[PDB]
């Protein structure tokens with residue numbers, strides 16, 4: 281825009297392009313997301329309102345929404361680094377447990393807040409978890425599938441990451457819940473600990489089968505109603521559940537217990553963000569400051 285001067289192209293988001301920009305008048309530095317359409321939704325612009333009214337230390341602030349010239353611009357407070365970059369930069373030594381614990385605890389606070397206000401993220405991944413020099417971590421780039429809804433990928437040519445998708449989404453459930461965000465965060469928690477993605481699928485079925493090979497193929501016993509799901513096939517191979525201690529070594533029992541509750545197959549058995557906050561794993565949580573190279 282004319283009121284904003286592009287500094288750098290931050291990346292090609294899920295809906296559009298993201299730039300680091302400066303408000304040519306206020307001098308404020310922000311993250312600007314540009315969105316593509318001929319009709320322009322309504323339930324969306326109102327769904328965006330819910331997002332703008334969200335105020336929480338662990339949620340990126342949506343400062344302004346500008347609809348002009350068939351383009352939709354979302355102005356967000358700017359953070360200097362994302363968790364994917366931080367994990368890559370920490371791959372040799374790993375992120376220290378106290379910081380992993382702090383980040384998980386803060387993200388659960390953010391989700392607990394979103395969820396109590398009936399807001400779902402839907403697409404948590406390391407790339408949209410932003411961190412600052414003060415030791416905070418915040419949820420960014422909320423899905424809003426209850427608006428445009430992810431069709432194929434994006435609007436040009438970009439491979440959508442399926443690594444953090446909950447099983448119920450992969451099995452075709454149209455009405456998923458807040459539980460989908462807990463699953464994604466559990467996958468991220470595992471990744472921070474082991475320094476390797478938990479379920480790195482390269483297709484929907486491979487994603488589903490990588491989950492099955494690790495947690496066991498779900499059945500009516502562990503997930504009532506699973507065989508009646510839209511894309512469930514009786515022909516799915518039957519894999520036995522692997523021993524959990526092989527999953528995230530050398531994470532302690534408190535951490536493994538919490539992770540297991542975040543990865544329950546049944547969305548109704550999966551722990552809530554609020555209940556997770558009370559888990560024994562956080563008894564000694566603190567707020568360390570990360571070493572960030574900007």
Ligand SMILES: C=CCNc1nc(N)c(C(=O)c2ccccc2)s1
Pocket residue numbers: 290293294298311313340356357358359360361362407408410420421
């Ligand atoms: C991580 C480096 C860029 N700094 C960013 N700050 C904010 N606030 C961002 C976002 O809000 C964002 C938007 C779409 C996709 C990913 C992140 S990115």
